[PDB]
Specification:
- The structure is a homodimer.
- Chain A has 414 residues and is an alpha+beta fold.
- Chain A folds into three domains: 169 residues, Nitric Oxide Synthase, Chain A, domain 1 (Alpha-Beta Complex); 103 residues, Nitric Oxide Synthase,Heme Domain, Chain A, domain 2, CATH 3.90.440.10; 89 residues, Bovine Endothelial Nitric Oxide Synthase Heme Domain, Chain: A,domain 3 (Alpha-Beta Complex), CATH 3.90.1230.10.
- Chain A is built from eleven helices and 18 strands.
- In chain A, the strands form seven sheets. A four-stranded mixed sheet of chain A has the order 3-4-15-12, with helices on both faces.
- In chain A, strand 13 and strand 14 form a beta hairpin.
- In chain A, helix 1 packs antiparallel against helix 2, helix 7 packs across helix 9 and helix 8 crosses helix 9.
- Chains A and B meet through helix 7, helix 9 and helix 10 of A and helix 8 and helix 9 of B.
- The complex binds protoporphyrin IX containing FE (HEM) (2 copies), 5,6,7,8-tetrahydrobiopterin (H4B) (2 copies), arginine (2 copies) and zinc ion.
- One arginine (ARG) binds next to strand 16 and helix 7 of chain A.
- Chain A: Belongs to the NOS family.
């Protein structure tokens, strides 16, 4: 019932009792574990043909409110049952309800805290929550997005933020941001099977063209936003260059590195996930914080299905790309992550290396153990793409579950 | 689509379904409400000792199941020999309460247990395994001879060959055949004066135990330990492996001439000897197995782990790296060079070893093979992906389904 969690580096032991508070089931069963799966249709929140049965919405709602009041410590006062009957009443009549700006603020922070795949949750209590639930057009969403960016970037001193657009309603389409991230580089499928730019962004780069975008011819062209208001065709919105803070990549010692022309944006704002608070769902709620050096250095730049530069860098360093035993790949990677850490630091833009990050996650796990009696973590995601064992998280046993409020995955609006 | 776990490879975009998992028989650590897939020893991968023989129906159910697998492998399901063997087994379990495997049945189960090991990334050679029957063994001294024969064969002068030696199974009442060591070849861990540990911290408990049973300890950082073999109901006897048998590799770097000066070294033969081999309900408490090393097991885990040799900082200082700041990636720079040293050394010493890229690239082919063969392959992602350069390796991008298939290598409690 209560999983014994052990750290093999220190022999320390803890029992996760918070997992008992999970109400949403995962993909695993006693017969088999599916923990390494990126997304089963279970953790997904697909569209629907009818409204969520009241009985359920009411219970998830009641729970959230019970959580919120326990947080501000007024758990039990008249204001609690005043808010409980207010929801019970609104639900019984409209079939739904709405959240107060304070409850939404507590909800978004708790969704982050509950995000199993987030290694930066040490900073969960520090989130700027922009209420954009008064949006009605794609043009309004754009304005709301441009403010989110301008603020989050803050000239380089990045700061966590989230803009929450209008919730989903059983009687209409969804407010959606088509791009997976507010800032992404374009991926142009060339003549043969080749790809100019980011291979992960080919599909979206095609859709923008479909909606009249005039495409560039570079590996680092920033994509325009495709914002969609309920039941309306999406709209193309080119982002203001000055808003988009980018960082030219250079190496502290390898002078020729700079000559590669590599660069990466400063803001990691995820815009395709769904935020769920109290049973209500927000199909558009872009959030952002700052980058961990590996997200760019290893994955975005070194993944074989991404920029894939390992070899280019390797031959520049003059490594033996003949056999895998010379470790040219491992070597080239470290230098790339080094170039990233050097560059962002030189450009006075916030980043956190994987050692610093995982170290902070260890303290967070501790704080959470004392706070809630456990902490949901996804080992495969928490452990960095390189130097896994060189970091403390690798040696830490973790328990994974679904706690609400939560950031869920959701279908693409096309 | 198909009502089976859909598996995707994010690098290639290819999808496969796992039908094989349908054949599993034992529950795991996970439940729908929580994934305990990152635990090393959940009480679900362990098989506790038995103060009583397995209930004749359950033991028989596994037996029947194993026999069927055997016949399916030789392509004689439903045949006269198949049905006869089944009767032979339930007949034997009937009068004695247990049964015995046939020579070929054991070779099959043993290779099947390897094939079914979720945490092994070297399963591509599962078919090529030398099974040394040692079910005739009756004494601790005979165990030593067997193990020595094993090390000799498997070491084959740095041209390692996969092998396992199966000692007598667990009989009701009669004590078990146990090798107290975790591996045949293991360095000693001396609990120091200040509190530290000279040698290998992992082996402190066993090193303390060897001393209690009469071992005369040295005081080195790389002292091979003596075997503490135990025959049924008898006390464990100390046995010292002769230096000639224990092949070792002195570590040196291909460019950093000073690395050699570090005096670091590792043994060529990786021989796990504390795991229980389960086949058809029959338990083999002693059955050491070995193959060859994957470079990261030594260069990253054995040498760099904080709770192991922890030589990361030392090498960093020698490379003249700023170990004051995290952002310098000094841990990353040293570890790469240490792993390169391990690779280089074993190559120079003409001892068999495989790097994490090649090892991993070969596990992908094994996966494709096992897809076409059984409709899946139970893999433990956490253990399959190397402790370094994870995403530079293709298995990182491969979703994996993990489940328990019998025969299998399972953990068991320590003899003491
Ligand atoms: C404060 C700085 C932050 C850092 C350094 C950080 C870092 C990370 C990293 C390394 C990942 C994995 C990303 C990947 O490999 O795709 C991640 C995932 C995630 N983070 Fe954070 N995070 C931070 C802020 C935020 C904020 C502000 C939120 C939400 C309000 C958040 C929510 C999440 C969620 C839900 C995921 C899962 C993403 C997915 O499933 O694709 N993070 N974070
Ligand atoms: C042929 C060469 C082989 C290679 C390269 C290989 C490689 C590996 C690696 C890298 C591990 C991880 C061990 C750790 O990090 O603790 C592993 C685990 C394992 N291997 Fe293999 N293996 C090989 C041969 C064998 C053989 C011959 C057997 C058995 C007949 C076997 C059975 C297993 C099992 C059961 C584990 C589980 C380890 C544990 O749970 O502690 N392997 N192998
Ligand atoms: C298949 C596997 O789960 C997948 O490649 C995961 C592994 N761990 C990860 N971890 C993080 N942080 N991000 C990812 O994209 C991945 N991909
Ligand atoms: C806690 C976590 O399961 C543990 O540290 C695992 C991670 N992956 C591993 N992978 C391998 N190959 N070997 C190990 O010992 C581990 N340890
Ligand atoms: N720091 C974050 N919260 N990042 C969210 C995911 C960003 C994504 N991994 C990228 O490389 O763009
Ligand atoms: N290749 C193997 N059979 N490895 C088994 C585990 C060995 C262990 N990781 C070691 O380095 O000693
Ligand atoms: Zn699981």
């Amino acid at each position: 019932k209560f999983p014994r969690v052990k750290n093999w580096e220190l022999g320390s032991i803890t029992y996760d009792t918070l997992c008992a508070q999970s109400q949403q089931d995962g993909p695993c069963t006693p017969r088999r574990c599916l923990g390494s799966l990126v997304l089963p249709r279970k953790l997904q929140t697909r569209p629907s043909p009818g409204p969520p049965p009241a009985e359920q919405l009411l219970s998830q709602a009641r729970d959230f409110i019970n959580q919120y009041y326990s947080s501000i410590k007024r758990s039990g006062s008249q204001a609690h049952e005043e808010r409980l009957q207010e929801v019970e009443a609104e639900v019984a009549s409209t079939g739904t309800y709405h959240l107060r700006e304070s409850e939404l603020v507590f909800g978004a922070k708790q969704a982050w805290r509950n995000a199993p795949r987030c290694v930066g949750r040490i900073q969960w209590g520090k989130l700027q929550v922009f209420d954009a639930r008064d949006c009605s057009s794609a043009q309004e969403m754009f304005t709301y997005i441009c403010n989110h960016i301008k603020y989050a970037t803050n000239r380089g001193n990045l700061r966590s933020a989230i803009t929450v657009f209008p919730q989903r309603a059983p009687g209409r389409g969804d407010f959606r941001i088509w791009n997976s991230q507010l800032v992404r580089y374009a991926g142009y499928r060339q003549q043969d099977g080749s790809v100019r730019g980011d291979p992960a962004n080919v599909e979206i780069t095609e859709l923008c063209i479909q909606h009249g975008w005039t495409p560039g011819n570079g590996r680092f062209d920033v994509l325009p936003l495709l914002l969609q208001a309920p039941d309306e065709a999406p709209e193309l919105f080119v982002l203001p260059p000055e808003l988009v803070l980018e960082v030219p990549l250079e190496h502290p010692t390898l002078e020729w590195f700079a000559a590669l022309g590599l660069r990466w944006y400063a803001l990691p704002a995820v815009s395709n996930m769904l935020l769920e608070i109290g049973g209500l769902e927000f199909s558009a709620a872009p959030f952002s914080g700052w980058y961990m050096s590996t997200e760019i250095g290893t994955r975005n730049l070194c993944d074989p299905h991404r920029y894939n530069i390992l070899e280019d860098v390797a031959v520049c360093m003059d490594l033996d790309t003949r056999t895998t035993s010379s470790l040219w790949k491992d070597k080239a990677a470290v230098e790339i992550n080094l170039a990233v850490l050097h560059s962002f630091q030189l450009a006075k833009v916030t980043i956190v290396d994987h050692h610093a990050a995982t170290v902070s996650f260890m303290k967070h796990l501790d704080n959470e153990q004392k706070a809630r009696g456990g902490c949901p973590a996804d080992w495969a995601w928490i452990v960095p793409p390189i130097s896994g064992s060189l970091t403390p998280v690798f040696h830490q046993e973790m328990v994974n579950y679904i706690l609400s409020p939560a950031f869920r995955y959701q279908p693409d609006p096309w």
